[PDB]
Design an enzyme around this catalytic site. Structure first.
Site, PDB file in Angstrom:
ATOM      1  CB  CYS A 224     -12.541 -16.165 -13.673  1.00 47.93           C
ATOM      2  SG  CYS A 224     -13.325 -14.992 -12.557  1.00 47.93           S
TER       3      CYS A 224
ATOM      4  CG  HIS B 264      -5.144 -12.640  -9.612  1.00 46.61           C
ATOM      5  ND1 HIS B 264      -4.940 -11.541 -10.203  1.00 46.61           N
ATOM      6  CD2 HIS B 264      -6.326 -12.385  -8.670  1.00 46.61           C
ATOM      7  CE1 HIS B 264      -5.790 -10.474  -9.724  1.00 46.61           C
ATOM      8  NE2 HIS B 264      -6.641 -11.144  -8.931  1.00 46.61           N
TER       9      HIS B 264
END
Length: 257
Positions: A28, A207
């Protein structure tokens, strides 16, 4: 319901500025975006604060997006960009699929999550560019996205025509050989691109990291909880394709554990 994160308090622009830390190395990009806002002093935290929820970071972000006064360009679109941002605001906590294109470092398949970045004037970049020095692959991949290349690689396995089965592999190759989603040609293009001392977000291996150019190098902010205590550790060079990299204070000077 919500996750917790610890707050590194560092001196930024000679003023005690907060940043958010995470060992988890989750996909996230809430923290990547938020950290930028905190640096930009758009969101302020009470000096004392040690920990923060997602639900806080979210609400801080919500206020921020709704607080954007328009500045001319997309006019009907701007209102849809807000409503889009607003509707996909929760998906930020959770995690986010990203269909990169290999056509250049600002190239992705639009998902409405892109609207949050566009609104806050935060560039999103990735490292995964095909090298014009391998025109075999340049042609095989063409103007095509990632999750699309897989669909087609599979399509090409089963294809009768062995023109395809060849390219089906010519591509299977390019991914087999660029597993760490940052090619040399990527780094070059990405460095050149990113404005001097402008805060961007860098996508790679599911990421999101906070990026800047500084004295014509690329540094990433140090989200790693590991160096929570260490006020001197903030930027990690993205000087090499892979390997070793020098940490720095908030002024982009060397620092040691």
């Amino acid at each position: 319901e919500p996750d917790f994160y610890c707050v590194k308090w560092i001196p930024w622009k000679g003023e005690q500025t907060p940043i958010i830390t995470q060992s988890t190395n989750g996909p996230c990009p809430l923290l990547a975006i938020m950290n930028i806002l905190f640096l930009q002093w758009k969101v302020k935290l009470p000096p004392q604060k040690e920990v923060i929820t997602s639900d806080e970071l979210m609400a801080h972000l919500g206020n921020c997006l709704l607080s954007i006064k328009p500045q001319e360009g997309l006019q009907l679109n701007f209102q849809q960009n807000v409503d889009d941002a607003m509707t996909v605001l929760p998906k930020l906590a959770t995690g986010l699929d990203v269909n990169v294109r290999f056509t250049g470092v600002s190239d992705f398949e639009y998902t409405p999550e892109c609207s949050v970045f566009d609104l806050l004037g935060i560039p999103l970049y990735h490292g995964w560019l095909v090298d014009p020095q391998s025109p075999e692959a340049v042609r095989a991949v063409g103007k095509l996205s990632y999750n699309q290349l897989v669909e087609r690689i599979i399509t090409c396995k089963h294809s009768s025509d062995t023109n395809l089965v060849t390219e089906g592999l010519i591509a299977e190759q390019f991914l087999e050989t660029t597993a760490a989603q940052l090619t040399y040609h990527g780094l070059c293009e990405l460095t050149a691109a990113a404005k001097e001392g402008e805060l961007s977000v860098f996508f790679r291996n599911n990421h999101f990291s906070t990026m800047t150019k500084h004295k014509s190098h690329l540094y990433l902010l140090v989200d790693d909880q590991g160096f929570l205590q260490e006020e001197q550790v903030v930027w990690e060079s993205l000087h090499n394709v892979d390997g070793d990299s020098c940490f720095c204070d908030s002024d982009f000077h060397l620092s040691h554990s």
